[PDB]
Structure 1
């Protein structure tokens, strides 16, 4: 029973964020700033209802969803695309498919120990993020 992801989470590693951003066609200037940044993620979770706020000094991004309920997602101030998103549970791993113009786009997020893991995929690029609880 490790589905409880509530908390404030501070990034400690960010593997291949550059490649993931390039796969989303983020321009070089934006990538140059973004790749440097420590992200903080606040998760407010009530059962299958999630509200997430991811912040940095450069961009912030909020996304809310209910597991199992498809929603329209506009990735405002990231790559600024519209997708149809669905989050499901696979065991205790939160799995999101973002269907749209980029093939194989999604993410997976789960707890292991006292860390939160987030793997973001676009095409053949995977970014692996690890967060420690504050």
Structure 2
């Protein structure tokens, strides 16, 4: 988990609009989230991980323990049952609600942080640079 720690900034985004759309977000919000480049901060204290997402539009913060289910309310205002795990070197975040699911996967690939969001048939890829 240690190489994930620190400050990272958004450098490239692909297919965010289809993802948002598949989840049910409105056009007006979509406009706004597409011009925005967030800051992500990953910290640790013992066995508790903290995840901050900062932007000029919306801000979020969660704290958890790997492999333990927790309640979360997302940036688009969903209320879900979540669990985060380490699988083959990757940081896998599973969210469940109303009988449906979405995955958020983080990978370190040649100096960089790569995030891939999957919902239904839609798949989005986002890359971050270490600040």
For 1:61-80, list aligned pairs within 5 A: 61-75=60-74, 78-80=75-77
Aligned to 2:55: 56
Question: After the TM superposition, which parts of structure 1 deviate over 6 Å for at least 4 consecutive aligned residues?
Answer: none
The answer for unaligned runs of 5 or more in structure 2 is none
* Paired positions, count: 131
- Residues 1:92 and 2:85 are matched in the alignment: no
Quote the residue 1:13 is aligned against. Answer: 12
TM-score by length of 2: 0.91
Q: C-alpha displacement at 1:47, in angstroms?
A: 6.4
Query: Aligned-residue CA RMSD in angstroms?
Result: 1.7
Which consecutive residues of structure 1, in runs of 5 or more, have no partner in the other structure?
A: none
Alignment of 1:1-134 (within 5 A): 4-46=3-45, 49-75=48-74, 78-101=75-98, 103-134=100-131
Question: CA distance change for structure 1 residues 34 and 92 in 2, over 3 Å: closer, same or farther?
Answer: same
- Residues in 2 aligned to 1:46 and 1:112: alpha-carbon distance in whole angstroms: 25
Q: Is the 8 A contact 1:4 1:45 kept in 2?
A: no
Q: Distance in 2 between matches of 1:7 and 1:88?
A: 19
Checking the alignment, whether the CA contact within 8 Å between 1:3 and 1:110 is kept in structure 2 is no
Distance in 2 between the 1:118 and 1:60 partners? 18
CA distance in 2, matches of 1:102, 1:20: 18
Whose helix proportion is higher, 1 or 2? Answer: 2
TM-score by length of 1: 0.89
| Distance of 1:54 and 1:87 partners within structure 2 | 16
Counterpart Cα distance in 1 of 2:96 and 2:16: 20
CA-CA distance at 1:18 after TM superposition: 0.6
